[PDB]
Write a structure and sequence with these properties.
Oligomer: heterotrimer
Largest interface: A-C, 29 and 27 residues
Largest sheet of chain B: none
PDB class: immune system
Chain A: HLA class I histocompatibility antigen, A alpha chain
Assembly: trimeric
Keywords: influenza virus, TCR, T cell
Helix content of chain C: under 10%
Number of strands of chain C: 9
Entry title: Crystal Structure of HLA A*0301 in complex with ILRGSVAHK, a 9-mer epitope from Influenza A
Distance between the termini of chain B: 22 Å
Chains: A alpha+beta, B little secondary structure, C mainly beta
Number of domains of chain C: 1
Strand content of chain C: over 45%
Largest sheet of chain C: 5 strands, antiparallel
Shape of chain B: elongated
Strand content of chain B: under 5%
């Protein structure tokens, strides 16, 4: 199927407690392969996947310089954005950045992206065409004007639909033996009385990949949305995900309910029913 | 690999 | 402009008493990123707990996975204790095999 390469950056100011905390993480699909943490012992970009360890000293020297350059940029941008948003020097603030590219199963470029946030809200994003920007407000528009004048979109595009694609293809070839593949969910239902008259029916989906999944509950073929308890999809810690959806039902009425599982690894959407007797 | 050029805001 | 963490405490594999497994505490949907997470065994902090590197979702909210190898028993109680600016006191979520 399709694949992605993404770099995630978080910089958090610590007024009067030193320089900002900076954490960078590189992923191929949902697999971390590199990391940098300003609070870590090495002060270097570090390998996190077995297939990246084979990279040479010049690779690690370059990744370290370049991740440190992003850290320094965020440090000055925290001061700049505090100015744009008219905030004091006392509070802690956050810059988040994500950029990357997607390729098809035949290695072809599909899309590139860059999104930036300030204090957990949109700040600026590169558009789908890789030529223009969308600023979230009037302060972020100051950055957009600076990047339009600097022709930043062209420079960034050369990386997103170029360099990013070249290296993502190399990493996919280098990690082909271990990289997580599509795995359909293993599904089952559990039954938990909450009293003498009611029970929780819990529909489980385990060991699946990708994380995208839809769990729905129906009472007599009619949707149960607003009565369903859905948990956030969560990591098993092995590269696959888990999720459950629950409904509180009257005892004796279990068979009226159906759980519906939709996933890209399944040939057909599944229907689960609690069958009593 | 990461970008080799950075943009100030 | 703050978001409270969603906390889930669970095992990687279905729990079986006396069988080695992984205890997970997945904390997600929170903002800002500063957070304290501890895994507990009978109310006592487990010492060699690892965690994923800070990352975030499409909505910009943060998530972290804290984990440790464990062997569940009928009598040992496990929990995840979380402290965040949005909480009046640290939140303790006991591990329940059914969730």
């Amino acid at each position: 199927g399709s694949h992605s390469m993404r770099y995630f950056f978080t910089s958090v100011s610590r007024p009067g407690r030193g320089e900002p905390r900076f954490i960078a993480v590189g992923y191929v699909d949902d697999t971390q392969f590199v990391r940098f943490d300003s609070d870590a012992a090495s002060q270097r970009m570090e390998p996190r996947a077995p297939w990246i360890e084979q990279e040479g000293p010049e690779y690690w020297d370059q990744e370290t310089r370049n991740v440190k350059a992003q850290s320094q940029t965020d440090r000055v941008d925290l001061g700049t954005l505090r100015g744009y948003y008219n905030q004091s020097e006392a509070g802690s603030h956050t810059i988040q950045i994500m950029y990357g590219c997607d390729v098809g199963s035949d290695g072809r470029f599909l899309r590139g992206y860059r999104q930036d946030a300030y204090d957990g809200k949109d700040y600026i994003a590169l558009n789908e065409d890789l030529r223009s920007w969308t600023a979230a407000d009037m302060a972020a528009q100051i950055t957009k004007r600076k990047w339009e004048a600097a022709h930043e979109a062209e420079q960034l595009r050369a990386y997103l639909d170029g360099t990013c694609v070249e290296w993502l293809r190399r990493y996919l070839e280098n990690g082909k033996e271990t990289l997580q593949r599509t795995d359909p969910p293993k599904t089952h239902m559990t039954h938990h009385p909450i009293s003498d008259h009611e029970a929780t029916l819990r529909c489980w989906a385990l060991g699946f990949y990708p994380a995208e999944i839809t769990l729905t509950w129906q009472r007599d073929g009619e949707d149960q949305t607003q009565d369903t308890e859905l948990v956030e999809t969560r990591p098993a810690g092995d590269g696959t995900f888990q999720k459950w959806a629950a409904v509180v039902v009257p005892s004796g009425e279990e068979q009226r309910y159906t759980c519906h599982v939709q996933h890209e690894g399944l040939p057909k959407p599944l229907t689960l029913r609690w069958e009593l007797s | 690999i990461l970008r080799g050029s950075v943009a100030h805001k | 402009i703050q978001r409270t963490p969603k906390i889930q405490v669970y095992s990687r594999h279905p729990a079986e008493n006396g069988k080695s497994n992984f205890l997970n505490c997945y904390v997600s949907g929170f903002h800002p990123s500063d957070i304290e997470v501890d895994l507990l065994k009978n109310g006592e902090r487990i010492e060699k707990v690892e965690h994923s590197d800070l990352s975030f979702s499409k909505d910009w909210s943060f998530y972290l996975l804290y984990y440790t190898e464990f062997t569940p028993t009928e009598k040992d109680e496990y929990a995840c204790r979380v402290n965040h600016v949005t909480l009046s006191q640290p939140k303790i979520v006991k591990w329940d095999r059914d969730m």
